[PDB]
Predict the structure of steroid delta-isomerase.
Amino acid sequence: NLPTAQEVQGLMARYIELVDVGDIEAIVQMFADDATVEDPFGQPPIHGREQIAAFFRQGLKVRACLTGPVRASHNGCGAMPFRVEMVWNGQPCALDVIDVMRFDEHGRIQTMQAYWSEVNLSV
Amino acid sequence: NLPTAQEVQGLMARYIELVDVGDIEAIVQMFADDATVEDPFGQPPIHGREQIAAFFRQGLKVRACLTGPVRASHNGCGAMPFRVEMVWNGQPCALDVIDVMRFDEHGRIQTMQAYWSEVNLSV
């Protein structure tokens, strides 16, 4: 069902866990079959699991951690702050991002938006 | 004009500065005349400066600080994590919140949403 405020904190923390290990199949399955992702926000969305799996396969070998608590409401929404550490073309970077997610009546991610731009990159 | 990614970080940091000191007139003026606020999100919005000034007057004597960097995009949007420290009915609390804002073609807050619920309260 629509996750409660407490369920939203657990699902969102799991999500960062999965991104950190890089288990692409487990990440993809957290999304609804027709979920849409906007990352970075301002960018056109990617729709459906096929496109999301491709987006994630494209980006993972990273380290990701929650840098503060998951903020959650009573209507299936959540927002969380986190940092991603990578090494781009030999140089190590860090990216501070804030993800906002909406869950469906099944506890799956229906919509996701990531807020960040070059001003949040430390290369 | 539409603030750039860097302008969005400055405006949003100013905002927390103003909430921290409690300068209600200066806060109100950061919003568009017909801006809408949803705080906490999931709650019906308040529209226009009159209602926003009333909302803020109702809540201020607090301490507020940014707990991480402001995440900003190129389309006038920003998201930031912060903590508010108060003392409710004799007992001191803390509330972790994430605000998401959209700015207008003038650099004023057009829409604001705050994400938090009781799971983010430390009383």
